């Protein structure tokens, strides 16, 4: 039934553009939408990755490793899964492993990799791979891990037990002004609901 | 330590605007960001997303999802039922309303998240995630009658909770739909639990 008729550029910055999208509705009528896209997407299967890093150590409960950063669009701090854009020619897995080490200092092992999933599909075309990665916290590589953050990146690491994630995220939200990412919250909720 | 110094409008559509955000980085250096915002926010958040748990006796529990054409994606996406919160609507009420309009089901509130961010490196968009149970053995949920608005065209997809991830992966492979990242994250945590 439905499909894109035309995409007209309305405004283009260095990083994001806004487009007027003309599409065919399933009645047969022509309609429009205001679409956001990134300018950085090349031949990657998605814009970015988000990493679900499960930190595993003998005689410890498993922890989910999360990051806290200032986010300019939000005007504040947010708690999220480690994440970044996929470099040109980089695989989603390499990008996940790389971003996890840069944001946390951990060296992980790939567990699984999702298909490309949409971030906010009524607003933008942005997509990611969700890459699950186990971290062997008994390995010396991962003992006293140093974040190697890039140009103007300033990330704090927060490891929360998987068995109590939702309450621990609620505790954090109770204690400061800070926003939990929707993917992180959805994951915490399903841990509870299981 | 980090904060917003100012926001310059770049472009404002009917629904979405692009801004240039000046902010103070933690080194004490001024930096800029390209930020997307909706023009519709009043509210606690922009929207709600509903996790609708369809409970029918002697059947598997299902998570109720919707499939729609998304103009920004240029394709069909599988998502939790969702929409914008009307000015003066509570998140809980927007959840029950949107769940009804999109699926036909009449549900009960189980819990509601604080405002969580959709894509905080890109936008300030936020939602409340609202867990809702649907008593599928009540008469009002027998022949659920969707009340979809002008220009909305929503197909309902109910998937069993205890196989959700495998079922979604199967839909992506065979139907070439895009699964929403929140849906996928929830699905992943269901498998990752314990
Ligand atoms: C029901 N509703 C959906 C809205 O959002 C949009 N609609 C069109 N173009 C872009 C966007 Cl983001 C506003 N109200
Ligand atoms: C690492 N990286 C993140 C990027 O995205 C943006 N960067 C600045 N302003 C807005 C956006 Cl969306 C580009 N590269
Ligand atoms: Cl539940
Ligand atoms: Mg990042
Ligand atoms: Mg980074
Ligand atoms: Mg909707
Ligand atoms: Mg609507």
Curated annotation (Swiss-Prot), chain A:
A motif (Nudix box) lies at residues 84-105. It catalyses: D-ribose 5-phosphate + ATP + H(+) = ADP-D-ribose + diphosphate; ADP-D-ribose + H2O = D-ribose 5-phosphate + AMP + 2 H(+); 8-oxo-dGDP + H2O = 8-oxo-dGMP + phosphate + H(+). Changing residue 32 to D: Phosphomimetic mutant; unable to generate ATP in the presence of diphosphate. There is a cross-link at residue 29 (Glycyl lysine isopeptide (Lys-Gly) (interchain with G-Cter in SUMO2)). The modification Phosphothreonine is found at residue 32. Residues 44-184 form the Nudix hydrolase domain. Its cofactor is Mg(2+). Binds 3 Mg(2+) ions per subunit. GO terms for molecular function: 8-oxo-dGDP phosphatase activity; ADP-ribose diphosphatase activity; ADP-sugar diphosphatase activity; identical protein binding; magnesium ion binding; nucleotidyltransferase activity; protein homodimerization activity; snoRNA binding. Widely expressed. Most abundant in liver. Keywords: Acetylation, Hydrolase, Isopeptide bond, Magnesium, Metal-binding, Nucleus, Phosphoprotein, RNA-binding, Transferase, Ubl conjugation. Its main location: nucleus. It comes from the Eukaryota. One of its GO terms (biological process) is ribose phosphate metabolic process. Changing residue 85 to A: Reduces affinity for substrate about 6-fold. Substrate binds at residues 15, 33-34, 38, 71, 85, 120. It is found in: Nucleus. Its EC number is 3.6.1.13, 3.6.1.58, 2.7.7.96. The modification Phosphotyrosine is found at residue 61. Mg(2+) 3 binds at residues 99, 103, 153. PANTHER family: ADP-SUGAR PYROPHOSPHATASE (PTHR11839:SF24), UDP/ADP-SUGAR PYROPHOSPHATASE (PTHR11839). Homodimer. Interacts with PARG. Belongs to the Nudix hydrolase family. This is ADP-sugar pyrophosphatase. It comes from Homo sapiens.
Curated annotation (Swiss-Prot), chain B:
Its EC number is 3.6.1.13, 3.6.1.58, 2.7.7.96. Keywords: Acetylation, Hydrolase, Isopeptide bond, Magnesium, Metal-binding, Nucleus, Phosphoprotein, RNA-binding, Transferase, Ubl conjugation. Binds 3 Mg(2+) ions per subunit. Mg(2+) 3 binds at residues 98, 102, 152. A motif (Nudix box) lies at residues 83-104. Substrate binds at residues 15, 33-34, 38, 70, 84, 119. The keyword Transferase applies. The modification Phosphothreonine is found at residue 32. Widely expressed. Most abundant in liver. The modification Phosphotyrosine is found at residue 60. GO terms for biological process: ATP generation from poly-ADP-D-ribose; chromatin remodeling; D-ribose catabolic process; nucleobase-containing small molecule metabolic process; nucleoside phosphate metabolic process; nucleotide metabolic process; ribonucleoside diphosphate catabolic process; ribose phosphate metabolic process. InterPro entries: Nudix_hydrolase, NUDIX_hydrolase-like_dom_sf, NUDIX_hydrolase_CS, NUDIX_hydrolase_dom. It is found in: Nucleus. Changing residue 84 to A: Reduces affinity for substrate about 6-fold. Induction: Overexpressed in cancer patients with a poor outcome. Residues 43-183 form the Nudix hydrolase domain. CDD domains: NUDIX_ADPRase_Nudt5 (cd18888). Coiled coil: none annotated. Phosphorylation at Thr-32 is required for homodimer stability; dephosphorylation results in destabilization of the homodimer. Dephosphorylation at Thr-32 promotes the ATP-synthesis activity. It catalyses: D-ribose 5-phosphate + ATP + H(+) = ADP-D-ribose + diphosphate; ADP-D-ribose + H2O = D-ribose 5-phosphate + AMP + 2 H(+); 8-oxo-dGDP + H2O = 8-oxo-dGMP + phosphate + H(+). There is a cross-link at residue 29 (Glycyl lysine isopeptide (Lys-Gly) (interchain with G-Cter in SUMO2)). Belongs to the Nudix hydrolase family. Homodimer. Interacts with PARG. Enzyme that can either act as an ADP-sugar pyrophosphatase in absence of diphosphate or catalyze the synthesis of ATP in presence of diphosphate. In absence of diphosphate, hydrolyzes with similar activities various modified nucleoside diphosphates such as ADP-ribose, ADP-mannose, ADP-glucose, 8-oxo-GDP and 8-oxo-dGDP. Can also hydrolyze other nucleotide sugars with low activity. In presence of diphosphate, mediates the synthesis of ATP in the nucleus by catalyzing the conversion of ADP-ribose to ATP and ribose 5-phosphate. Nuclear ATP synthesis takes place when dephosphorylated at Thr-32. This is ADP-sugar pyrophosphatase. The lineage of its organism: Eukaryota, Metazoa, Chordata, Craniata, Vertebrata.
């Amino acid at each position: 039934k439905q499909y894109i008729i035309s995409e007209e550029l309305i405004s283009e910055g260095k990083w994001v553009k806004l487009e007027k999208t003309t599409y065919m509705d399933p009645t047969g009528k022509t309609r429009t939408w205001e679409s956001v896209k990134r300018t950085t997407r090349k031949e990657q299967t998605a814009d970015g990755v988000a990493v679900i890093p499960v930190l595993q150590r003998t005689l410890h409960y498993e922890c989910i490793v999360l990051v806290k950063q200032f986010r300019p669009p939000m005007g504040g701090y947010c708690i999220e899964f480690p994440a970044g854009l996929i470099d040109d020619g980089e695989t989603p897995e390499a990008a996940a492993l790389r971003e996890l080490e840069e944001e946390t200092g951990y060296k992980g092992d790939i567990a699984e990799c999702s298909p490309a999933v949409c971030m906010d599909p009524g607003l933008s075309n942005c997509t990611i791979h969700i890459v699950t990665v186990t971290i062997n916290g008994d390995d010396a590589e991962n003992a006293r891990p140093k974040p190697k953050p890039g140009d103007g990146e300033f990330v704090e690491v927060i490891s929360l037990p998987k068995n109590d994630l939702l309450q621990r995220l609620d505790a954090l939200v109770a204690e400061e002004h800070l926003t939990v990412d929707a993917r992180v919250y959805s994951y915490a909720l399903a841990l509870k609901h299981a």
